[PDB]
Amino acid sequence: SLNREYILIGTGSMTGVYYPIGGSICRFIASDYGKDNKIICSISSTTGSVYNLNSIRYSNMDISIVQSDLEYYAYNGLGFYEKMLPMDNLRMLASLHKEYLTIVVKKSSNISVIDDIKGKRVNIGSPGTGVRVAMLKLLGEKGWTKKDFSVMAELKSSEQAQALCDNKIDVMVDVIGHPNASIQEASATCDIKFIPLDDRLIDDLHAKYPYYQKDIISGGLYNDSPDIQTVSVKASLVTTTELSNDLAYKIVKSIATHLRELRSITGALKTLTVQDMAKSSITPMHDGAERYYKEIGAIK
Ligand SMILES: [Cl-]
């Protein structure tokens, strides 16, 4: 019939990074194809990769921005998805920016190494998010549980900057690309520093949790600061085999065609290239996406 294909893209809170990225994708789609009256794209602002992946599982959402941790678990039916069927029909459209496990304190705090966060007021993020998974794994490695902290706050990126500078939390924890506006806000409001992860912790995390890569947040992004050793994951745009070859192709092509605008959406995307988009190490690439990346030589 003459109805447009209605595409819904899971993102996150309007205060976050995913929301404007997804909004931009819908705009690229409208600009490239809107006049042909076959496609209409919308975003969802509900937070969390669990929500988004469940919405995809139940066929009420087509595509979502997620990150590697919950992508890995959903695809494999492991960990938090232990009791569910693997989402074996999940497919990647494009890898996006890296997100780094980022631990931030006031310089005035006593805190210098990871073991100093024990006993403090710390953020563990909202349920169903990459931050929550990272914190559960980190506590896991250290053998720590709720009794070992005075406060386990459940704040989003923006909320943490203010909470940290007001001393309502001692340790901001996020899994985010850099440079990031919330960290910038924090550093403009009080004097902050980053806590690195030690070699053994990074090695153990990468060994146990294949979605975490050993990585470095380069120094000097927000103030005078050193390189910070930590782990990273990737944000990615995922879908399922229910999305047609044609739409997967068209969507990836629209993003690639508008890459220079995408780079401008947030600081962490400035370096993104088509070669970066074409990588997928957890979920198979959608056939229609692969068609595009091969056509332009982003994959050999
Ligand atoms: Cl999330």
From TrEMBL:
Record Pfam families: NMT1_3
Superkingdom of origin organism: Bacteria
InterPro entries, alphabetized: TRAP_TAXI
CDD domains hit by this protein: PBP2_TAXI_TRAP_like_3 (cd13568)
Annotated disulfide bonds: C26-C41, C165-C190
Keywords attached to this entry: Signal
Keyword ATP-binding included in the entry's annotation: no
SUPFAM superfamilies xrefs: Periplasmic binding protein-like II
Annotated NCBIfam families: TRAP_TAXI
Protein name listed in UniProt: Immunogenic protein
Organism annotation: Ehrlichia chaffeensis (strain ATCC CRL-10679 / Arkansas)
UniProt lineage: Bacteria, Pseudomonadati, Pseudomonadota, Alphaproteobacteria, Rickettsiales
